[PDB]
PDB file of C-alpha atoms and ligand atoms in Angstrom:
ATOM      1  CA  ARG A   4      78.670  44.943 -67.900  1.00  0.00           C
ATOM      2  CA  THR A   5      81.283  47.666 -66.011  1.00  0.00           C
ATOM      3  CA  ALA A   6      80.526  48.712 -62.044  1.00  0.00           C
ATOM      4  CA  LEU A   7      77.848  50.955 -61.433  1.00  0.00           C
ATOM      5  CA  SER A   8      78.586  54.878 -60.845  1.00  0.00           C
ATOM      6  CA  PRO A   9      75.945  57.692 -60.081  1.00  0.00           C
ATOM      7  CA  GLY A  10      73.747  59.184 -62.959  1.00  0.00           C
ATOM      8  CA  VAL A  11      72.458  62.631 -62.777  1.00  0.00           C
ATOM      9  CA  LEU A  12      69.184  63.446 -60.490  1.00  0.00           C
ATOM     10  CA  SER A  13      66.287  64.666 -61.760  1.00  0.00           C
ATOM     11  CA  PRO A  14      64.804  67.266 -59.481  1.00  0.00           C
ATOM     12  CA  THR A  15      62.756  66.894 -56.646  1.00  0.00           C
ATOM     13  CA  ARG A  16      58.983  65.808 -57.826  1.00  0.00           C
ATOM     14  CA  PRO A  17      56.010  67.271 -56.576  1.00  0.00           C
ATOM     15  CA  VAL A  18      53.026  65.788 -55.011  1.00  0.00           C
ATOM     16  CA  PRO A  19      50.031  67.642 -54.616  1.00  0.00           C
ATOM     17  CA  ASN A  20      49.766  69.672 -51.690  1.00  0.00           C
ATOM     18  CA  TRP A  21      46.497  67.527 -50.474  1.00  0.00           C
ATOM     19  CA  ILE A  22      48.317  64.027 -49.837  1.00  0.00           C
ATOM     20  CA  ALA A  23      49.253  64.264 -46.186  1.00  0.00           C
ATOM     21  CA  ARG A  24      53.072  64.164 -46.069  1.00  0.00           C
ATOM     22  CA  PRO A  25      54.505  61.871 -42.938  1.00  0.00           C
ATOM     23  CA  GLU A  26      55.840  64.220 -39.979  1.00  0.00           C
ATOM     24  CA  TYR A  27      59.414  63.280 -41.256  1.00  0.00           C
ATOM     25  CA  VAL A  28      59.340  65.002 -44.623  1.00  0.00           C
ATOM     26  CA  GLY A  29      61.098  68.280 -44.241  1.00  0.00           C
ATOM     27  CA  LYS A  30      63.516  66.726 -41.300  1.00  0.00           C
ATOM     28  CA  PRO A  31      66.555  65.450 -40.889  1.00  0.00           C
ATOM     29  CA  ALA A  32      65.575  62.374 -38.899  1.00  0.00           C
ATOM     30  CA  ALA A  33      62.423  60.736 -38.362  1.00  0.00           C
ATOM     31  CA  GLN A  34      60.502  60.648 -35.182  1.00  0.00           C
ATOM     32  CA  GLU A  35      60.170  56.799 -34.793  1.00  0.00           C
ATOM     33  CA  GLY A  36      61.776  53.657 -33.214  1.00  0.00           C
ATOM     34  CA  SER A  37      59.390  53.496 -30.048  1.00  0.00           C
ATOM     35  CA  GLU A  38      55.956  52.383 -31.635  1.00  0.00           C
ATOM     36  CA  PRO A  39      53.935  49.591 -30.418  1.00  0.00           C
ATOM     37  CA  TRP A  40      54.739  46.771 -32.207  1.00  0.00           C
ATOM     38  CA  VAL A  41      51.248  45.131 -32.282  1.00  0.00           C
ATOM     39  CA  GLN A  42      48.995  47.324 -33.735  1.00  0.00           C
ATOM     40  CA  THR A  43      45.290  48.627 -33.550  1.00  0.00           C
ATOM     41  CA  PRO A  44      42.511  46.669 -35.684  1.00  0.00           C
ATOM     42  CA  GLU A  45      42.014  50.074 -37.017  1.00  0.00           C
ATOM     43  CA  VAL A  46      45.748  50.633 -38.127  1.00  0.00           C
ATOM     44  CA  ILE A  47      45.676  47.063 -39.423  1.00  0.00           C
ATOM     45  CA  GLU A  48      42.686  48.101 -42.142  1.00  0.00           C
ATOM     46  CA  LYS A  49      44.527  50.725 -43.139  1.00  0.00           C
ATOM     47  CA  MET A  50      47.676  48.786 -43.794  1.00  0.00           C
ATOM     48  CA  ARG A  51      45.730  46.681 -46.039  1.00  0.00           C
ATOM     49  CA  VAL A  52      45.146  49.857 -48.080  1.00  0.00           C
ATOM     50  CA  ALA A  53      48.304  50.857 -48.155  1.00  0.00           C
ATOM     51  CA  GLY A  54      49.852  47.949 -48.610  1.00  0.00           C
ATOM     52  CA  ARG A  55      47.646  46.955 -51.619  1.00  0.00           C
ATOM     53  CA  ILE A  56      48.818  50.678 -53.405  1.00  0.00           C
ATOM     54  CA  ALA A  57      52.701  49.640 -52.352  1.00  0.00           C
ATOM     55  CA  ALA A  58      51.975  46.737 -54.397  1.00  0.00           C
ATOM     56  CA  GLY A  59      50.297  48.579 -57.081  1.00  0.00           C
ATOM     57  CA  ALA A  60      53.086  50.953 -57.718  1.00  0.00           C
ATOM     58  CA  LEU A  61      56.026  48.026 -57.299  1.00  0.00           C
ATOM     59  CA  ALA A  62      54.042  46.373 -60.056  1.00  0.00           C
ATOM     60  CA  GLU A  63      53.767  49.174 -61.982  1.00  0.00           C
ATOM     61  CA  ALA A  64      57.078  50.215 -62.189  1.00  0.00           C
ATOM     62  CA  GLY A  65      58.435  46.508 -62.772  1.00  0.00           C
ATOM     63  CA  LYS A  66      56.922  46.374 -65.670  1.00  0.00           C
ATOM     64  CA  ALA A  67      58.754  49.449 -67.144  1.00  0.00           C
ATOM     65  CA  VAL A  68      62.082  47.351 -66.776  1.00  0.00           C
ATOM     66  CA  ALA A  69      63.811  46.709 -69.937  1.00  0.00           C
ATOM     67  CA  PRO A  70      66.621  47.422 -71.409  1.00  0.00           C
ATOM     68  CA  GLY A  71      67.197  51.345 -72.237  1.00  0.00           C
ATOM     69  CA  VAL A  72      65.065  52.639 -69.296  1.00  0.00           C
ATOM     70  CA  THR A  73      66.281  54.703 -67.040  1.00  0.00           C
ATOM     71  CA  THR A  74      66.405  54.348 -63.093  1.00  0.00           C
ATOM     72  CA  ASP A  75      65.368  57.848 -62.760  1.00  0.00           C
ATOM     73  CA  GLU A  76      62.160  56.723 -64.813  1.00  0.00           C
ATOM     74  CA  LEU A  77      61.053  53.673 -62.681  1.00  0.00           C
ATOM     75  CA  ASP A  78      60.778  55.923 -59.767  1.00  0.00           C
ATOM     76  CA  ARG A  79      58.408  58.618 -62.276  1.00  0.00           C
ATOM     77  CA  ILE A  80      56.198  55.523 -62.982  1.00  0.00           C
ATOM     78  CA  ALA A  81      56.121  54.704 -59.284  1.00  0.00           C
ATOM     79  CA  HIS A  82      55.287  58.110 -57.793  1.00  0.00           C
ATOM     80  CA  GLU A  83      52.464  58.381 -60.355  1.00  0.00           C
ATOM     81  CA  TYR A  84      51.170  55.426 -59.005  1.00  0.00           C
ATOM     82  CA  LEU A  85      51.651  56.537 -55.748  1.00  0.00           C
ATOM     83  CA  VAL A  86      49.991  60.144 -56.347  1.00  0.00           C
ATOM     84  CA  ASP A  87      47.319  58.763 -58.604  1.00  0.00           C
ATOM     85  CA  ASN A  88      46.310  56.688 -55.786  1.00  0.00           C
ATOM     86  CA  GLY A  89      46.313  59.403 -52.489  1.00  0.00           C
ATOM     87  CA  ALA A  90      49.510  58.299 -51.267  1.00  0.00           C
ATOM     88  CA  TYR A  91      52.724  59.725 -50.335  1.00  0.00           C
ATOM     89  CA  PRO A  92      56.202  58.023 -51.419  1.00  0.00           C
ATOM     90  CA  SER A  93      57.442  57.197 -47.676  1.00  0.00           C
ATOM     91  CA  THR A  94      61.083  57.229 -49.016  1.00  0.00           C
ATOM     92  CA  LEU A  95      60.554  60.894 -50.311  1.00  0.00           C
ATOM     93  CA  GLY A  96      62.247  63.086 -48.019  1.00  0.00           C
ATOM     94  CA  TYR A  97      62.487  60.525 -45.688  1.00  0.00           C
ATOM     95  CA  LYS A  98      66.002  61.328 -43.727  1.00  0.00           C
ATOM     96  CA  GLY A  99      66.898  63.478 -46.828  1.00  0.00           C
ATOM     97  CA  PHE A 100      66.250  60.556 -49.605  1.00  0.00           C
ATOM     98  CA  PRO A 101      65.376  62.398 -52.851  1.00  0.00           C
ATOM     99  CA  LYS A 102      63.301  59.658 -54.455  1.00  0.00           C
ATOM    100  CA  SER A 103      60.008  57.927 -54.031  1.00  0.00           C
ATOM    101  CA  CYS A 104      61.505  54.701 -54.587  1.00  0.00           C
ATOM    102  CA  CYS A 105      64.930  53.135 -54.320  1.00  0.00           C
ATOM    103  CA  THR A 106      66.221  51.233 -57.351  1.00  0.00           C
ATOM    104  CA  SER A 107      69.199  48.752 -56.768  1.00  0.00           C
ATOM    105  CA  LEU A 108      70.670  47.277 -60.084  1.00  0.00           C
ATOM    106  CA  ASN A 109      73.236  44.772 -59.981  1.00  0.00           C
ATOM    107  CA  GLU A 110      76.116  44.861 -57.383  1.00  0.00           C
ATOM    108  CA  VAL A 111      73.687  47.607 -55.269  1.00  0.00           C
ATOM    109  CA  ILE A 112      72.490  45.765 -52.060  1.00  0.00           C
ATOM    110  CA  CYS A 113      70.046  48.644 -51.472  1.00  0.00           C
ATOM    111  CA  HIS A 114      69.170  52.152 -51.265  1.00  0.00           C
ATOM    112  CA  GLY A 115      69.887  52.817 -54.962  1.00  0.00           C
ATOM    113  CA  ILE A 116      69.349  56.241 -56.204  1.00  0.00           C
ATOM    114  CA  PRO A 117      66.899  56.952 -59.236  1.00  0.00           C
ATOM    115  CA  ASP A 118      69.231  58.636 -61.403  1.00  0.00           C
ATOM    116  CA  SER A 119      70.141  59.213 -65.226  1.00  0.00           C
ATOM    117  CA  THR A 120      71.580  55.481 -65.318  1.00  0.00           C
ATOM    118  CA  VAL A 121      70.666  53.127 -68.342  1.00  0.00           C
ATOM    119  CA  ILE A 122      69.568  49.742 -67.688  1.00  0.00           C
ATOM    120  CA  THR A 123      70.982  47.455 -70.406  1.00  0.00           C
ATOM    121  CA  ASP A 124      70.504  43.773 -71.380  1.00  0.00           C
ATOM    122  CA  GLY A 125      71.082  41.251 -68.584  1.00  0.00           C
ATOM    123  CA  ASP A 126      70.811  43.663 -65.863  1.00  0.00           C
ATOM    124  CA  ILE A 127      68.926  43.011 -62.522  1.00  0.00           C
ATOM    125  CA  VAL A 128      66.870  45.553 -60.589  1.00  0.00           C
ATOM    126  CA  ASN A 129      65.191  46.020 -57.429  1.00  0.00           C
ATOM    127  CA  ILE A 130      62.666  48.213 -57.030  1.00  0.00           C
ATOM    128  CA  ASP A 131      61.882  49.118 -53.328  1.00  0.00           C
ATOM    129  CA  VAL A 132      58.690  51.231 -52.890  1.00  0.00           C
ATOM    130  CA  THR A 133      56.808  52.393 -49.575  1.00  0.00           C
ATOM    131  CA  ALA A 134      53.507  53.966 -49.671  1.00  0.00           C
ATOM    132  CA  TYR A 135      52.083  56.431 -46.752  1.00  0.00           C
ATOM    133  CA  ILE A 136      47.837  56.922 -46.911  1.00  0.00           C
ATOM    134  CA  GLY A 137      45.630  56.949 -43.932  1.00  0.00           C
ATOM    135  CA  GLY A 138      48.416  57.632 -41.292  1.00  0.00           C
ATOM    136  CA  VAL A 139      50.313  54.312 -41.932  1.00  0.00           C
ATOM    137  CA  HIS A 140      53.175  52.479 -44.237  1.00  0.00           C
ATOM    138  CA  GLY A 141      52.727  49.552 -46.585  1.00  0.00           C
ATOM    139  CA  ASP A 142      56.090  48.461 -47.863  1.00  0.00           C
ATOM    140  CA  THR A 143      57.405  46.527 -50.983  1.00  0.00           C
ATOM    141  CA  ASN A 144      60.134  45.699 -53.087  1.00  0.00           C
ATOM    142  CA  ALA A 145      61.035  42.805 -55.943  1.00  0.00           C
ATOM    143  CA  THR A 146      63.677  42.277 -58.293  1.00  0.00           C
ATOM    144  CA  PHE A 147      62.931  42.366 -62.104  1.00  0.00           C
ATOM    145  CA  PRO A 148      65.450  41.192 -64.925  1.00  0.00           C
ATOM    146  CA  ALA A 149      66.001  43.316 -67.904  1.00  0.00           C
ATOM    147  CA  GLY A 150      66.292  41.382 -71.518  1.00  0.00           C
ATOM    148  CA  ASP A 151      68.696  38.529 -71.482  1.00  0.00           C
ATOM    149  CA  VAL A 152      69.852  37.565 -67.681  1.00  0.00           C
ATOM    150  CA  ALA A 153      72.496  35.172 -67.600  1.00  0.00           C
ATOM    151  CA  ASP A 154      71.380  31.930 -66.010  1.00  0.00           C
ATOM    152  CA  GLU A 155      73.762  32.512 -62.416  1.00  0.00           C
ATOM    153  CA  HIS A 156      71.599  35.725 -62.240  1.00  0.00           C
ATOM    154  CA  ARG A 157      68.235  34.244 -62.577  1.00  0.00           C
ATOM    155  CA  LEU A 158      68.918  31.768 -59.954  1.00  0.00           C
ATOM    156  CA  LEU A 159      69.975  34.580 -57.493  1.00  0.00           C
ATOM    157  CA  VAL A 160      66.410  36.012 -58.172  1.00  0.00           C
ATOM    158  CA  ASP A 161      64.314  33.064 -58.004  1.00  0.00           C
ATOM    159  CA  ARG A 162      66.030  31.928 -54.861  1.00  0.00           C
ATOM    160  CA  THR A 163      65.989  35.388 -53.274  1.00  0.00           C
ATOM    161  CA  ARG A 164      61.815  34.972 -54.090  1.00  0.00           C
ATOM    162  CA  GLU A 165      62.049  31.571 -52.590  1.00  0.00           C
ATOM    163  CA  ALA A 166      63.780  32.332 -49.758  1.00  0.00           C
ATOM    164  CA  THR A 167      61.413  35.503 -48.960  1.00  0.00           C
ATOM    165  CA  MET A 168      58.048  33.051 -49.348  1.00  0.00           C
ATOM    166  CA  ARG A 169      59.663  30.499 -47.083  1.00  0.00           C
ATOM    167  CA  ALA A 170      60.152  32.685 -44.668  1.00  0.00           C
ATOM    168  CA  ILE A 171      56.824  34.363 -44.603  1.00  0.00           C
ATOM    169  CA  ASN A 172      55.271  31.013 -44.332  1.00  0.00           C
ATOM    170  CA  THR A 173      56.416  30.605 -41.068  1.00  0.00           C
ATOM    171  CA  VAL A 174      54.957  33.969 -39.741  1.00  0.00           C
ATOM    172  CA  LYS A 175      52.514  32.726 -36.846  1.00  0.00           C
ATOM    173  CA  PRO A 176      52.011  33.423 -33.462  1.00  0.00           C
ATOM    174  CA  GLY A 177      53.785  32.129 -30.714  1.00  0.00           C
ATOM    175  CA  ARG A 178      56.716  30.965 -32.930  1.00  0.00           C
ATOM    176  CA  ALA A 179      60.227  33.079 -32.523  1.00  0.00           C
ATOM    177  CA  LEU A 180      60.873  35.786 -34.622  1.00  0.00           C
ATOM    178  CA  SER A 181      64.499  34.045 -34.961  1.00  0.00           C
ATOM    179  CA  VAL A 182      62.443  31.483 -37.286  1.00  0.00           C
ATOM    180  CA  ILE A 183      62.601  33.745 -40.109  1.00  0.00           C
ATOM    181  CA  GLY A 184      66.677  34.385 -40.242  1.00  0.00           C
ATOM    182  CA  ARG A 185      66.866  30.515 -39.819  1.00  0.00           C
ATOM    183  CA  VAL A 186      64.608  29.912 -42.570  1.00  0.00           C
ATOM    184  CA  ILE A 187      66.339  32.380 -44.913  1.00  0.00           C
ATOM    185  CA  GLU A 188      70.420  31.515 -43.944  1.00  0.00           C
ATOM    186  CA  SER A 189      69.483  28.340 -44.510  1.00  0.00           C
ATOM    187  CA  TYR A 190      67.882  28.609 -48.090  1.00  0.00           C
ATOM    188  CA  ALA A 191      70.967  30.590 -49.172  1.00  0.00           C
ATOM    189  CA  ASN A 192      73.434  28.617 -47.997  1.00  0.00           C
ATOM    190  CA  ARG A 193      72.357  25.529 -49.885  1.00  0.00           C
ATOM    191  CA  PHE A 194      73.396  27.317 -52.913  1.00  0.00           C
ATOM    192  CA  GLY A 195      76.632  28.621 -51.781  1.00  0.00           C
ATOM    193  CA  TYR A 196      74.923  32.506 -51.741  1.00  0.00           C
ATOM    194  CA  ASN A 197      75.430  34.823 -48.366  1.00  0.00           C
ATOM    195  CA  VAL A 198      72.844  36.857 -46.737  1.00  0.00           C
ATOM    196  CA  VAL A 199      73.207  39.913 -45.787  1.00  0.00           C
ATOM    197  CA  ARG A 200      73.629  41.229 -41.887  1.00  0.00           C
ATOM    198  CA  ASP A 201      73.809  44.849 -41.516  1.00  0.00           C
ATOM    199  CA  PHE A 202      70.698  45.727 -43.517  1.00  0.00           C
ATOM    200  CA  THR A 203      67.324  44.171 -41.845  1.00  0.00           C
ATOM    201  CA  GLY A 204      63.473  44.326 -42.104  1.00  0.00           C
ATOM    202  CA  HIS A 205      61.829  46.166 -39.509  1.00  0.00           C
ATOM    203  CA  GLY A 206      58.846  46.921 -37.810  1.00  0.00           C
ATOM    204  CA  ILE A 207      56.101  49.239 -39.769  1.00  0.00           C
ATOM    205  CA  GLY A 208      52.695  50.674 -39.142  1.00  0.00           C
ATOM    206  CA  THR A 209      51.939  54.277 -38.034  1.00  0.00           C
ATOM    207  CA  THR A 210      55.441  54.605 -38.457  1.00  0.00           C
ATOM    208  CA  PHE A 211      57.993  53.641 -41.438  1.00  0.00           C
ATOM    209  CA  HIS A 212      60.726  51.774 -39.564  1.00  0.00           C
ATOM    210  CA  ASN A 213      58.965  51.546 -36.132  1.00  0.00           C
ATOM    211  CA  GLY A 214      62.273  49.684 -33.999  1.00  0.00           C
ATOM    212  CA  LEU A 215      61.383  46.417 -34.463  1.00  0.00           C
ATOM    213  CA  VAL A 216      64.008  44.788 -36.163  1.00  0.00           C
ATOM    214  CA  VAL A 217      64.032  41.601 -38.109  1.00  0.00           C
ATOM    215  CA  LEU A 218      67.356  39.536 -39.035  1.00  0.00           C
ATOM    216  CA  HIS A 219      67.680  37.835 -42.143  1.00  0.00           C
ATOM    217  CA  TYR A 220      69.861  35.117 -41.052  1.00  0.00           C
ATOM    218  CA  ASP A 221      70.499  32.771 -38.344  1.00  0.00           C
ATOM    219  CA  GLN A 222      70.327  34.855 -34.848  1.00  0.00           C
ATOM    220  CA  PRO A 223      69.049  32.358 -31.981  1.00  0.00           C
ATOM    221  CA  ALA A 224      69.944  35.083 -29.307  1.00  0.00           C
ATOM    222  CA  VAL A 225      67.002  37.307 -30.454  1.00  0.00           C
ATOM    223  CA  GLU A 226      64.272  36.151 -27.972  1.00  0.00           C
ATOM    224  CA  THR A 227      61.141  38.237 -29.617  1.00  0.00           C
ATOM    225  CA  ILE A 228      58.068  36.022 -29.944  1.00  0.00           C
ATOM    226  CA  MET A 229      55.562  36.556 -32.763  1.00  0.00           C
ATOM    227  CA  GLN A 230      52.055  38.045 -31.489  1.00  0.00           C
ATOM    228  CA  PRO A 231      49.035  38.448 -33.282  1.00  0.00           C
ATOM    229  CA  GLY A 232      48.707  42.165 -34.719  1.00  0.00           C
ATOM    230  CA  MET A 233      52.427  42.855 -35.504  1.00  0.00           C
ATOM    231  CA  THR A 234      53.584  44.134 -38.679  1.00  0.00           C
ATOM    232  CA  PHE A 235      56.313  44.216 -39.763  1.00  0.00           C
ATOM    233  CA  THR A 236      58.856  43.620 -42.890  1.00  0.00           C
ATOM    234  CA  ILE A 237      61.202  40.496 -44.159  1.00  0.00           C
ATOM    235  CA  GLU A 238      62.806  41.527 -46.996  1.00  0.00           C
ATOM    236  CA  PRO A 239      66.310  39.780 -47.696  1.00  0.00           C
ATOM    237  CA  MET A 240      69.631  40.640 -49.747  1.00  0.00           C
ATOM    238  CA  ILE A 241      71.217  37.703 -50.802  1.00  0.00           C
ATOM    239  CA  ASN A 242      74.433  37.835 -52.591  1.00  0.00           C
ATOM    240  CA  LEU A 243      76.636  35.838 -54.499  1.00  0.00           C
ATOM    241  CA  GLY A 244      79.726  37.446 -53.648  1.00  0.00           C
ATOM    242  CA  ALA A 245      81.178  38.816 -49.818  1.00  0.00           C
ATOM    243  CA  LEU A 246      79.780  40.394 -47.582  1.00  0.00           C
ATOM    244  CA  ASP A 247      82.111  43.139 -47.079  1.00  0.00           C
ATOM    245  CA  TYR A 248      80.225  46.685 -48.757  1.00  0.00           C
ATOM    246  CA  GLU A 249      80.687  50.367 -49.339  1.00  0.00           C
ATOM    247  CA  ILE A 250      78.454  53.582 -49.316  1.00  0.00           C
ATOM    248  CA  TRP A 251      78.628  56.132 -52.353  1.00  0.00           C
ATOM    249  CA  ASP A 252      79.149  59.417 -51.865  1.00  0.00           C
ATOM    250  CA  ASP A 253      75.136  60.168 -52.232  1.00  0.00           C
ATOM    251  CA  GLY A 254      75.328  58.441 -48.431  1.00  0.00           C
ATOM    252  CA  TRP A 255      72.702  56.085 -49.604  1.00  0.00           C
ATOM    253  CA  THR A 256      74.136  53.868 -52.386  1.00  0.00           C
ATOM    254  CA  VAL A 257      75.044  50.251 -50.785  1.00  0.00           C
ATOM    255  CA  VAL A 258      77.327  48.551 -53.252  1.00  0.00           C
ATOM    256  CA  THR A 259      79.162  44.923 -52.847  1.00  0.00           C
ATOM    257  CA  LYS A 260      82.923  45.185 -52.311  1.00  0.00           C
ATOM    258  CA  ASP A 261      83.709  42.513 -54.897  1.00  0.00           C
ATOM    259  CA  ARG A 262      80.617  44.022 -57.233  1.00  0.00           C
ATOM    260  CA  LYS A 263      79.261  40.721 -57.855  1.00  0.00           C
ATOM    261  CA  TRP A 264      75.326  40.935 -58.049  1.00  0.00           C
ATOM    262  CA  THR A 265      72.843  41.012 -55.079  1.00  0.00           C
ATOM    263  CA  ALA A 266      69.153  40.545 -55.152  1.00  0.00           C
ATOM    264  CA  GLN A 267      66.219  41.127 -52.409  1.00  0.00           C
ATOM    265  CA  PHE A 268      62.360  40.703 -52.130  1.00  0.00           C
ATOM    266  CA  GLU A 269      60.440  42.838 -49.520  1.00  0.00           C
ATOM    267  CA  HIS A 270      56.730  42.014 -48.395  1.00  0.00           C
ATOM    268  CA  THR A 271      54.799  43.916 -45.090  1.00  0.00           C
ATOM    269  CA  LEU A 272      53.454  40.848 -43.410  1.00  0.00           C
ATOM    270  CA  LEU A 273      50.718  40.667 -40.229  1.00  0.00           C
ATOM    271  CA  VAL A 274      50.711  37.854 -37.636  1.00  0.00           C
ATOM    272  CA  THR A 275      47.287  36.954 -37.160  1.00  0.00           C
ATOM    273  CA  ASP A 276      45.191  34.689 -34.850  1.00  0.00           C
ATOM    274  CA  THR A 277      46.639  31.561 -36.454  1.00  0.00           C
ATOM    275  CA  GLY A 278      49.584  32.538 -38.874  1.00  0.00           C
ATOM    276  CA  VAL A 279      50.224  35.288 -41.162  1.00  0.00           C
ATOM    277  CA  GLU A 280      48.701  37.624 -44.016  1.00  0.00           C
ATOM    278  CA  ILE A 281      50.753  39.376 -46.940  1.00  0.00           C
ATOM    279  CA  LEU A 282      49.781  42.874 -46.621  1.00  0.00           C
ATOM    280  CA  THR A 283      51.706  43.720 -49.973  1.00  0.00           C
ATOM    281  CA  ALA A 284      50.130  41.170 -52.124  1.00  0.00           C
ATOM    282  CA  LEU A 285      49.244  42.149 -55.307  1.00  0.00           C
TER     283      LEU A 285
HETATM  284 CO1  LIG B 301      66.635  49.691 -46.130  1.00  0.00          CO
HETATM  285 CO1  LIG B 302      61.298  48.265 -48.642  1.00  0.00          CO
HETATM  286 CO1  LIG B 303      60.809  47.842 -45.478  1.00  0.00          CO
HETATM  287 NA1  LIG B 304      51.511  47.852 -44.730  1.00  0.00          NA
HETATM  288 NA1  LIG B 305      70.534  43.087 -52.860  1.00  0.00          NA
END
C-alpha cells in the first residue's frame, strides 16, 4: 500500500438555507475559546440531540467503508444524513475547512479532507463528524476497517477503541481531568503504541472548541477537576510509529513522518452528578 497523496476535492456541498449555520461560517476564524465549561440544563438537552444525530451520521458513513469507495463519498453520506436531520455539518467552513467531515486513512493522524482518494483492501479509515443543531455541537469519530485488514492494524483499532472507552469510564465529578490521559497512555504503552500529544480533546457546547483542552497523555500538572454539567470530547489518536508528523499543503491533513498507521475514536461526554453520559451514543 503506497503512502497517501491528495486526490481531487469535489465542489462545496450545499446545505439548504433553512439550516442555521454556526457563526463562523464564511469567516476566517471562530468566536470560541472563552465559553463556560459547565453547560446549562437547556444546552445539555440540546447536546443530546446534536449528539444523537452526529452518531447517526457516523454510523451511516462507516457502513459505506469498503474497498472501492472514495473518501469524498463518505462525506457525501455524512453530509446527507446531517442535512436530512436538520443539522449543519460543523466542519463545513470551520476555519476554511472545505468538507462536512474529516476522513483520515492509514497514516493520516487527523484532519483528512474527503476527496477522490479511493479506499483499498486492508485500509483503515477514521471518519470524524460534528453536528450543529439547536445552537449546539455534537462530535464523534471512529476508525473503520476496509476489507482484509492486517492483524497489526485490527489490534491497533480495537485497542484505540478500548483506550477511549476506558477513559470515558473514569469520567466523574471531583476526579481530576488528568486521569483521562493517564488511563489512555498507560493502555497504549502496554502495547508499545505512542499517544499523539499535539492534538487533543476539547470542551464543546454552543461552540465547537470552547477553550477547554483534554490531553490524551499523562500530564499531571493539569489541575482541572471535572464538575457536573461539563461537556467535552475524548478523542485519542494512537500511533504505531513515532509521533513526528507533517501537514499537507492543503493546510489540514496531518500525516505521520514514518508513514506508519494511526487510529482514533471520539465521543462527546457529559459529566453527570455522579458519573458520565455518552452524548454521541448510537
Ligand atoms: Co481536531
Ligand atoms: Co471530532
Ligand atoms: Co472533537
Ligand atoms: Na453533543
Ligand atoms: Na489517528
